[PDB]
């Protein structure tokens, strides 16, 4: 017990279903991070390629080996609000840029 090399796949294969539109973490092939997914038609993957990277070294897509589908990972929104407040007011005016 708690030894050897014969384990079970009753934990990692829980849902095996991914969404497209919400932000969630991922551990795809040892790569950790957060992002938003989006289905896209891609035909540049090979039999040994599963991740897509840019020159800077960031993952911008992947390919699932269980459904043969291609996606695109985009950074999730993390911004900052600029508010202006008067001398003796009660609530400042908010402005979300862009």
């Amino acid at each position: 017990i708690n030894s050897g090399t014969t384990c079970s796949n009753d934990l990692l294969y829980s849902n095996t279903e991914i969404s497209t539109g919400v932000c969630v973490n991922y551990d795809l092939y040892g790569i950790t991070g957060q992002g938003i997914f989006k289905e896209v038609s891609a035909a540049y993957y090979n039999n040994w390629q599963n991740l897509l990277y840019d020159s800077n070294g960031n993952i911008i897509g992947f390919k699932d080996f269980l459904t043969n589908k291609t996606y695109t990972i985009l950074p999730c929104y993390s911004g900052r609000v600029s508010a202006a407040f008067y001398q003796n007011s009660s609530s400042p005016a908010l402005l979300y840029r862009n």
Partner: protein, 48 residues
């Protein structure tokens, strides 16, 4: 010249500065809290 300065500073988040990796999520997922502060301190002192 302004674009090169912003892209050079952005690549500083991928350096290790002597740590085991560059992502803080990987450090906090493979090491215990007591021995994890020594790796995060190298990333904070390097990015600052």
């Amino acid at each position: 010249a302004n674009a090169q300065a912003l892209n050079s500073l952005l690549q500083q988040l991928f350096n290790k500065f002597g740590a085991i990796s560059s992502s803080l999520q990987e450090i906090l997922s493979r090491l215990d809290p007591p021995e994890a502060q020594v790796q995060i301190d190298r990333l904070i002192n390097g990015r600052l």
